[PDB]
Write a structure and sequence with these properties.
Two copies of one chain form a homodimer. By secondary structure, the first copy, chain A, is of the alpha+beta class. Chain A has 14 helices and 17 strands. Chain A has two domains: 317 residues, 2-Layer Sandwich (BirA Bifunctional Protein, domain 2); 98 residues, Rossmann fold (3-Layer(aba) Sandwich). In chain A, 37% of the residues lie in helices and 21% in strands. In chain A, helix 11 links the parallel strand 13 and strand 14. In chain A, helix 1 packs antiparallel against helix 4 and helix 5 packs antiparallel against helix 9. The two termini of chain A are 46 Å apart. Chain B: Belongs to the class-II aminoacyl-tRNA synthetase family.
């Protein structure tokens, strides 16, 4: 049974090239904002992965086949461990990206996460929170999947509002999150509705902010600062040129102590958040043995790809990176084919030399089935005249080109 | 009182070495893709039947959950076979793939391998074998770590030679295995070890004279052809010689110069795997590091679940090991801990909107930029940036902000220049 173990997915070449292209894209934006790569081991000391209630997740222990060890289930704990090991060698605030696969037991058992986090030592400017929506907008605009809104909220607001009613404290942590799945609950009084009208608040960013500042006088220390930090970040997001159609305040969103983001595809709301995160005070620093402010966002890429492909939002790529095939027209000309392929490669092009002996029709068929755009036909006459015939398999165009010009001709047809 | 360090043998880089790793991965990948190799990634975890199959298991790490037998991959060639089996009807053949996954071995218990293989259906052109030294050459010319020699052989020539001496298949394997240790244990010891395998003094001299054949590619090919005529009843020897000549000519036509390769009749790489061309790559003056890239043709290793004869050829770079080695030896230099090239300093907090805008603009020009938020005096910001190896600082002060202007401090040249609208162009210009 050569099958993949259940829950461990695997891309066909088309789909993996798509993932690589998205990964390249995300990496470009991450690095634009100064985020540095780290890759932590797949395997961690069990004591690290559980330390102070870290493991509801079934995790995977490792036994040798001829000291306790398990596979990471997220990237957040590894971040904490990482900073601990390299504390004196890092720059702060530490701005990192991580694109490792992680492992959970049950619907994917193995999936890739694309996280960025900035961690500071005693404090962390809010402008790190303002950068995140700028980061999210650039990624998903480049990725070309339709329009999206980044829903912003501050944990201090919703909770600062909660205290006004004076809910019991063992009961409040119980009825703080069961209000999320309102997607007028009577099984909430045993865990009145004044809070519903608040998470219902629907308006433009400046207006919602104004109703918040207006509500301030009515009630609220926490509420007040949450609204304040909600403004500083929003002004930041504007100063960084993020257009107003790309974000909104959504007070119903829900470790996090401040800024919180969720990202929704417009008209594809049922796929949930395609990018999430926010601000924490103690989620990293477990092993530092102290308090560390951070802001981070995460893209479950494996998850995102399967959902986006299945909904026809995302198009796969050709199964090959090759843009050009040098076809085999005659055996005696193989040295020429080898040479020309290397010339095209030198000019930056991705090339395949056909090695088999088959007629031109099948070489054409094979190159098009694989999504390769150009065929470079050189038979006896072409080679003697130091020329080639260029076939565009997509347009159907066919044109004669000097070998000296071939590489620049193909390139301007791609550009 | 927890201990947070990695488990023994699971290395992990600092930002600087991670940035070097990724730069190398980008370089390798670019070369692979120019020859049309496509990427795949198989799961870290496979079924235990698959990993143990055909006896081709090396200590491996199984998995039982902590509240169907399966294990972490230990090489990339088994997964590739299992991959072809799973997608047989969806792949194009010859199937050319690159794979850059981590693998796990117990004795580095985790290390990355950068592999390419072309796998064919019934037959595979020797021209795929010829591309490999071309691919190797391009890779280590880009990496830029000194000259190197791709040593090439063919198993049919080695096995074929032993067959002409009339020794059992079994003696041949253990002879090839002694020949594989020739450099380490020396000729005198090779002679003794051959004798312990039943090999007589005439056969012994012939063996050592053969594996020590050394000259230009053409004289080595000539000598082999002369041996062909002399012992004209090793059809395997003749086929090997033929194959080796096909690969060399292809290498040459691919424009690989002669200085980059030679024939090494002693390459005795994989016991039961390789059937044809074999490669090993030496960094001139650094043989202590061993091969920096090996591989070869294998006629019956990927059929594992197929049941078809599926010839393949591949090469491999143990990138984790090679990084540790090149770094320990001083051959390779690390990269700055940050991909940033520019820092917009914080002069006055009323000028954020301007810093933020100029950051995005520089970013839109394709530069990597860190906007400094925390406000300290000019000096401290230069020093914190220079410690990180960021080259450029954008200084937009009080009156400098007014006339749509800035001063930029290049921290390599230690020089400051007044530049507005033009900044991004003059940063790239001096970069």
């Amino acid at each position: 049974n050569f099958s993949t173990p259940s829950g461990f997915p695997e891309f066909l070449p088309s789909e993996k090239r798509l993932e690589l292209y998205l990964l390249d894209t995300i990496r470009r934006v991450y690095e634009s904002y100064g985020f540095t790569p780290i890759e932590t081991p797949a395997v961690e000391r069990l004591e690290v992965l559980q330390a102070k209630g870290n493991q509801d997740n079934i995790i995977y222990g490792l036994e040798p086949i001829l000291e306790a060890r398990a596979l990471k289930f997220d990237q957040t704990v590894p971040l904490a461990a990482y900073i601990a090991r390299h504390l004196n060698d890092l720059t702060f605030p530490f701005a990192r990206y991580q694109m490792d696969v992680v492992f959970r037991g049950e619907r994917f058992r193995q999936f890739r996460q694309c996280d960025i986090d900035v961690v500071g030592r005693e404090k962390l400017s809010l402008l790190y929170d303002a950068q995140m929506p700028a980061i999210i907008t650039e990624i998903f605009e480049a990725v070309n999947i339709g329009d999206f809104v980044i829903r912003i909220n501050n944990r201090k607001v919703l909770t600062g509002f909660f205290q006004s009613l004076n809910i019991s404290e063992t009961q409040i942590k119980s009825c703080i999150s069961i209000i999320d799945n309102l997607e007028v609950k009577l099984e909430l009084e045993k865990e009145t509705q004044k809070i519903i009208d608040f998470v219902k608040i629907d308006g433009s960013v400046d207006d919602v902010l104004d109703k918040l500042k207006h509500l301030s006088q009515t009630l609220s220390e926490q509420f007040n600062l949450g609204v304040s930090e909600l403004e500083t970040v929003i002004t930041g997001v504007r100063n960084l040129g993020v257009p107003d159609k790309r974000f909104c305040i959504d007070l119903a969103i829900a470790y996090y102590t401040g800024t919180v983001y969720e990202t929704t595809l417009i008209g594809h709301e049922a796929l949930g958040s395609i990018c999430s995160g926010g601000r924490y005070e103690e989620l990293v620093g477990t092993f530092i043995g102290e308090k560390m402010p951070g802001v981070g966002i995460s893209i479950g890429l494996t998850r995102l790809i399967s959902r986006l492909l299945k909904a026809g939002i995302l198009n796969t790529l050709p199964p090959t990176p090759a843009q050009v095939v040098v076809v085999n027209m005659q055996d005696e000309l193989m040295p020429t084919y080898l040479k020309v392929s290397q010339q095209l490669r030198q000019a930056g092009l991705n090339v395949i030399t056909n090695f088999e002996k088959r007629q031109l029709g099948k070489q054409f068929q094979a190159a098009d089935k694989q999504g390769i755009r150009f065929c470079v036909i050189i038979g006896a006459d072409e080679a003697a005249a130091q020329k080639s015939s260029l076939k565009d398999l997509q347009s159907g165009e066919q044109v004669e080109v000097a070998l000296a010009d071939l590489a620049e001709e193909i390139k301007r047809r791609l550009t």
